[PDB]
Design an enzyme around this catalytic site. Structure first.
Site, PDB file in Angstrom:
ATOM      1  N   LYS A   4       0.972  -1.311  -0.173  1.00  0.00           N
ATOM      2  CA  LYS A   4      -0.527   0.123   0.687  1.00  0.00           C
ATOM      3  C   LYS A   4       0.552   1.085   0.148  1.00  0.00           C
TER       4      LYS A   4
ATOM      5  N   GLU B 225       0.835  -0.333  15.925  1.00  0.00           N
ATOM      6  CA  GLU B 225       1.126  -0.596  15.132  1.00  0.00           C
ATOM      7  C   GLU B 225       2.318  -1.001  15.031  1.00  0.00           C
ATOM      8  N   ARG B 226       2.626  -2.237  14.833  1.00  0.00           N
ATOM      9  CA  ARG B 226       4.032  -2.784  14.844  1.00  0.00           C
ATOM     10  C   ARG B 226       4.650  -1.662  14.278  1.00  0.00           C
TER      11      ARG B 226
END
Lengths: 466, 55, 74, 74
Positions: A162, A188-189
């Site tokens: 993305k 988030e990671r």
């Protein structure tokens, strides 16, 4: 929040973790949104909305850490809440939730300070014009239109690259326009993040936009809080009368955070344990986005897709909330195509009809038919030999594989890998090329040219190259 | 003519195979709804019971 | 004819309460003895609206957070 | 190398911190810049541990009687 001298003390009444029972003067207290800070050992600490409770004591919370408590405790009350020093300098510069220049600090001087709590409705305010956003996307935009300041739903996922889409957006904002927007990840990671920073260097375009990121290492009060931030920040640029769109993170992360709050709230959750008011929050969120009379605010979001339960009240929201649909398909890319997106399965009520314009809806509306045919055809073939197939079937098969192929296109930003300079797409151009193509105009040409190609005039030149 | 009857047999059955197969998937989707109503349900009695355990 | 303004931000005061609110209007013509018409829908909103209300009520809801106010409401 | 000791008898205190207990260690190595790994299992008693505790704590349970602390915990 205060124009700050004094701001007093209170005591720390009852404390379980983030639960902040504490008491201020008997006379008065600032709003729940309004807030106050207390230096605890190393640092000041500010806790979130107290809600209403007695004796100057009322119930509060903070994302920060609660260790090292003291029964008697004193907090200097901040007043005009949430004032925050953004400046245009922020783009390409990163701060913490506090605006703390989180990264290697860009030191980030800022002349703007404003509460994010700012409402952003106004009756009749925004323009009545209903402009579409013009993406120059050979299929995304051409295949489907885009409205200025519009909300956009995301389907796609891991392996979609993305970011490739995003970078496309980067070249797209500057290239397309002066307007520049930033999005921020939360929950988030981390590795993805830093890699994306490097990827910004590689991108090199990072300057135009910048953000603090949540990374899910953090406490919720922060997390749930973050939204209002970006709200205010872009509210610089749309407030700048500039106009823009930012990407958005997993909502279910967000709303769910809503529940964790509500348990925290001790309040009875909504059903299926949603935030009993969670809809209201959505009111905040979806309500936030607008293309102002003088500014445009669009955006896209990917929410944690929960088991793909359509029963999802959250899906209800999305479906309710969503203004547009992304689709991306690992099988589709898995054709090999650069464009992973689901070619089928794309809908924007916006993009739809006549009054969305007809002929576009004509080459378009039939383009649907082509889709159907390639479905039936691509479908039916393996069953048996195609000899029986009518020619029309065959010719369709060519215009099919090659129409498909014809979609694939170069990208400027793509260069870094390949040097591909790409190009900004053109609607008249597009409708032209496709429309004629549909007619089987210039039926003779080679299919191979069409894949990852330039314009029908340019691919036409490739016929010369051919 | 025996033979024609024969190969014809093989194909005809062959054709039936597809359709018969295809039908059930719908039912499966219905069932999906059933575990949907149901997922809803466990969510439900569970929920009512969760308030209930809150008591 | 006219209609009344109703928005997402609108509070279950305005929100849960509103369609109810607008009713007495027709008593102009209807109470003038004149027929009059109105459309409303999406009333479901009113339900969890009014239910968030019930959380306030702190009263136990029914299925789908529901009280019987519907009837009364209805 | 050293492994933790964890017993069925182990007081729930030790239990509930017990991995979080575990954490401080490798901060030696990694914080020493030395490199390390560790096993993780589904201990999972932890929820009735920290949680059944929370009942003792009178605390509000989350789903499966267990609050989102897992996330937090995790």
């Amino acid at each position: 929040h205060h124009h700050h001298h004094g701001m007093a003390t209170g005591k720390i009444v009852q404390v379980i973790g983030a639960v902040v029972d504490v008491e201020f003067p008997q006379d008065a207290v600032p709003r729940v949104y309004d807030a106050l800070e207390v230096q605890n050992g190393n640092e000041r600490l500010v806790l979130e909305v107290q809600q209403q409770l007695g004796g100057g004591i009322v119930r509060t919370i903070a994302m920060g850490s609660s260790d090292g408590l003291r029964r008697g405790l004193d907090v200097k009350d901040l007043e005009h809440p949430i004032e925050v020093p953004v400046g245009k300098a922020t783009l390409g510069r990163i701060m913490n939730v506090l605006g703390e220049p989180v990264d290697m600090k860009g030191e980030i001087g800022e002349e703007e300070r404003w509460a994010i709590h700012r409402a952003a409705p106004s009756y009749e305010e925004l323009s009545n014009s209903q402009e579409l956003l013009e993406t120059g996307i050979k299929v995304i935009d051409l295949m489907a239109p885009f409205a200025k300041g519009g909300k956009v739903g995301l389907f796609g996922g891991a392996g979609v690259g993305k970011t490739v889409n995003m970078m496309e957006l980067i070249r797209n904002i500057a290239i397309e326009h002066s307007g520049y927007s930033v999005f921020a990840g939360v929950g988030e990671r981390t590795r993805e993040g830093n890699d994306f920073y490097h990827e910004m260097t590689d991108s090199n375009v990072i300057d135009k936009v910048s953000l603090v990121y949540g990374q899910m290492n953090e406490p919720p009060g922060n997390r749930l809080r973050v939204a209002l931030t970006g709200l205010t920040m872009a509210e610089k640029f749309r407030d700048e009368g500039r106009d823009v769109l930012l990407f958005v993170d997993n909502i279910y992360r967000y709303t769910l955070a809503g529940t964790e709050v509500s348990a925290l709230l001790g309040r009875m959750p909504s059903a299926v344990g949603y935030q009993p008011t969670l809809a209201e929050e959505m009111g905040v969120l979806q309500e936030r986005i607008t293309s102002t009379k003088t500014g445009s605010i669009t955006s896209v979001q990917a929410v944690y897709v929960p088991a793909d339960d359509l029963t999802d009240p959250s899906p209800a929201t999305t479906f309710a909330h969503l203004d547009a649909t992304v689709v991306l398909s690992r099988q589709i890319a898995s054709l090999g195509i650069y464009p992973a997106v689901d070619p089928l399965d794309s809908t924007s009520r916006q993009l739809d009809p006549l009054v969305v314009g007809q002929e576009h809806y004509d080459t378009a509306r039939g383009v649907q038919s082509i889709l159907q045919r390639y479905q039936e055809l691509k479908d039916i073939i393996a069953i048996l030999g195609m000899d029986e197939l009518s020619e029309e079937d065959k010719l369709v098969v060519a215009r099919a594989r090659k129409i498909q192929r014809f979609l694939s296109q170069p990208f400027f930003v793509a260069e870094v890998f390949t040097g591909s300079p790409g190009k900004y797409v053109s609607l008249k151009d597009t409708i032209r090329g496709f429309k004629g193509i549909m007619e089987g105009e210039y039926d003779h040409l080679p299919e191979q040219a069409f894949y990852m190609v330039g314009s029908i005039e340019e691919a036409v030149e490739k016929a010369k190259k051919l | 003519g025996v033979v024609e009857n024969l190969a014809s047999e093989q194909a005809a059955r062959m054709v039936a195979m597809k359709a018969a197969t295809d039908n059930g998937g719908s039912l499966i989707k219905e069932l999906q709804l059933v575990y949907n109503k149901a997922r809803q349900a466990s969510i439900t009695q569970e929920l009512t019971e969760i308030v209930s355990g809150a008591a | 004819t006219i209609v009344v303004v109703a928005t997402a931000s609108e509070s279950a005061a305005l929100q849960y309460l509103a369609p109810y609110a607008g009713a007495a209007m027709g008593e102009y013509f209807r109470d003038r003895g004149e027929d009059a018409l109105i459309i409303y829908d999406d009333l479901s909103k009113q339900a969890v609206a009014y239910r968030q209300i019930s959380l306030l009520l702190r009263r136990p809801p029914g299925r789908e957070a529901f009280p019987g106010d519907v009837f009364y409401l209805h």
